[PDB]
Design a protein around this ligand. Structure first.
Ligand SMILES: [Ca+2]
Ligand SMILES: [Ca+2]
Ligand SMILES: [Ca+2]
Ligand code: NA
Length: 295
DNA sequence: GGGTTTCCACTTATTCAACATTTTAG
DNA sequence: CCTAAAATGTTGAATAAGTGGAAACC
């Protein structure tokens, strides 16, 4: 029954939200197409209570299973989309997703004017959809023979505050205990790692985390044709003095919170040098077993 | 109406989270 | 030598993004 701070909500939407525009062949519509406009977040079942909390913050949206292991919050009821717009006007998005929101807003105006029931409005929705997310299907492009741009301006914005960061990290952030086989006396080095992962279309934002948080580095990764970035922090001093205090003051949501708290336990032990004792490493190992995929 | 809207079931691709090992720095 | 810090690479599923079907609203 708890609500979410609005900037945390926008950071979580930058991480996990998606805007939807359906343009559907419909034999019963006057113009031959019906439409649906919306916002949605799909998460693993274990984080259903986040969706319930967003739903009670906005008082809009419906929650439904999405397959066997996930669950969605979807807002497509047209009048309820005014809450979505009012929220993201007041607490605006930061990632390239802001561009998708701007297209969602253009689609909202077409629909608010009832133009989507006419030829000209459907054509404008098609032009808007061509720039949104994955674009037009081949079928829908062939149905609207017209030179239609798929290009948009890139978004370039700075992290607005640490609440946005707590929300974004609740989505994309990762805290772990990395056990490194070592030549140390004890034979296992404990490394705490904070990671944020993102596609390269938001390299600017990613690169800025180094300055925003005053620590870390960025790597690129390649998997066949796909590319993404990690921001990482591995220096214990930065973890303990910069990362941990941020998220104690700006509280994570979801089960990621419990992983952060467990991570902070191991930070305490390292600060006490108990990671260099057998009784310590044993406890660290137990804590790690119950984090992330092992929870 | 009956054209339009809204919801639920369910699918798809891949961008995330996750992870361990291997070097390097100091 | 002893630890800490950074780099090297994967992996596969939790995301993002999307479609089929139809009840029922206005
Ligand atoms: Ca994302
Ligand atoms: Ca995500
Ligand atoms: Ca490599
Ligand atoms: Na996530």
């Amino acid at each position: 029954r708890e609500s979410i701070n609005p900037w945390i909500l926008t950071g979580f939407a930058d991480a996990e939200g998606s805007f939807l525009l359906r343009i559907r062949n419909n034999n019963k519509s006057s113009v031959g197409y019906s439409t649906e406009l919306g916002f949605q977040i799909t998460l693993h079942n274990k984080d259903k209570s986040i969706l319930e909390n967003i739903q009670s913050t906005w008082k809009v949206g419906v929650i439904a299973n999405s397959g066997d292991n996930a669950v969605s919050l979807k807002v497509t009821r047209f009048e309820d989309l005014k809450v979505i717009i009012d929220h993201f006007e007041k607490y605006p998005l930061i990632t390239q997703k802001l561009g998708d929101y701007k297209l969602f807003k253009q689609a909202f105006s077409v629909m608010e004017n009832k133009e989507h029931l006419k030829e000209n409005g459907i054509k404008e929705l098609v032009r808007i959809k061509a720039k949104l997310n994955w674009g037009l299907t081949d079928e829908l492009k062939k149905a609207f023979p017209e030179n239609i741009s798929k290009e948009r301006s890139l978004i370039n914005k700075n992290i607005p505050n640490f609440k946005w960061l707590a929300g974004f990290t609740s989505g994309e952030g990762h805290f772990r205990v990395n056990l490194i086989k070592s030549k140390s006396k004890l034979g296992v080095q404990v490394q705490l790692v904070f990671t944020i992962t993102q596609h390269i279309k938001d390299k600017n934002l990613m690169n800025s985390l180094i300055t925003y948080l005053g620590c870390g580095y960025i790597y690129e990764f390649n998997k066949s044709e796909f590319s993404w970035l990690d921001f990482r922090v591995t220096k214990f001093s930065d973890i303990n003095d910069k990362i941990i205090p941020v998220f104690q003051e700006n509280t994570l949501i979801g089960v990621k919170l419990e992983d952060f708290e467990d991570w902070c336990k191991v930070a305490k032990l390292i600060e006490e040098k108990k990671h260099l004792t057998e009784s310590g490493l044993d406890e660290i190992k137990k804590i790690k077993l119950n984090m992330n995929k092992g929870r």
